[PDB]
Amino acid sequence: MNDKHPTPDPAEDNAFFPSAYSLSQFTASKSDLSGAHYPTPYQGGRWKILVVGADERYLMMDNGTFFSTGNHPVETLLPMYHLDKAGFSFDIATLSGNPVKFEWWAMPREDQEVNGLYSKYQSSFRQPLKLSDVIETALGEDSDYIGVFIPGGHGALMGLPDSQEVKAVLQWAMKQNKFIISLCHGPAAFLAVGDDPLFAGYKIVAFPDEMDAQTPSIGYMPGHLTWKFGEQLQAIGFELLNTGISGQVFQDRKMLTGDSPLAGNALGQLAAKALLAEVEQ
């Protein structure tokens, strides 16, 4: 209960879930989902949002252990929940086409609304599209995507940050003036553009590197991260706005970001409002 030892994951050798203590502090049985009420939702039936999810659960730490991570389900589902109520549908993809991997230990088991939304999308999380197919047939000048959503969780730190596929998607979104929506560790994916200065001067919130340096001290992760995505984001032009976390969000043009696992509800409100205002041409 107050145990700070990482919790072995029976599926994978030398792999650990967060400690029982860290779970009692950083997860809850209910979310703070609120204000998802849009009286005049989009009903045009065209515009959709592309979700780029994590296909891996096991992240290699600096001491040889695997953190049993994935996408954070609250960070994933709260924004979707608002966008759903606003009238937008989702297509879900991973790099490999393998199933989206959730941090199930952060899923709020008592939250009827959040569990209802997962039920609606579960077939797509479990059997997602392969991003290469999306890039081949669903983007370009006349795409039906109004935006792209890249949820956080430390799973976002694998593959996405240097995928040439993610690069193509981000280049397309900026070129075609589409929304890019992310939070927490999700913005690590933005690194995929490599040395393309496309994001120079953009302002975002993201999970602070300094906090990643400290959570393993209470067993949240079984080791430390082998690199620092915040510093890398700064190095390609991003201004990181936040030192700590509070669940806040920022909109810089069509780039919408949230700061942490506290930011899902606010990011949903922000995204729904922006996309509703947009759907007007």
Please count the other Cβ atoms lying within 10 Å of the Cβ belonging to residue 104. Answer: 12
2-11 long-range CB contacts below 8 Å, 24 or more apart?
Answer: 3/219, 4/218, 4/219, 5/219, 6/65, 6/219, 6/221, 6/222, 7/219, 9/66, 9/68, 11/68
Using left for φ > 0, alpha for ψ between -120 and 50, and beta otherwise, residue 141 falls in: alpha
Rounded distance, CA 15 to CA 224, Å? Answer: 13
Nearest to 83 by CA among 222, 181, 185, 213: 181
Q: What is the resolution of this structure in A?
A: 1.9
Does the annotation mark 119 as catalytic?
no
Largest separation between any pair of C-alpha atoms in the chain: 55
**Residue 60 in tokens:** 């290699």
The highest-level CATH class for domain 1-281 is alpha beta
> DSSP letter string over the chain?
----S-EE-TTSTTEEEPPHHHHHHH--SS--------SS---SS--EEEEE-----EEEPTTSPEEE--B-HHHHHHHHHHHHHTT-EEEEEESSSPPPPB-GGGS-TT-HHHHHHHHHHHHHHHSPEEHHHHHHHT-STT-SEEEEEE--SGGGGSSGGG-HHHHHHHHHHHHTT-EEEEETTGGGGGGGGTT--TTTT-EE----HHHHTTGGGGTSSSS--SS-HHHHHHHTTPEE--SS-SS-EEEETTEEEE-STT-HHHHHHHHHHHHHHH---
Q: Which of 51, 183, 184, 275 is catalytic?
A: 184
| Method by which this entry was solved | X-ray
Please name the residues in contact with 116: beta carbons below 8 A apart, sequence gap of 6 or more.
Answer: none
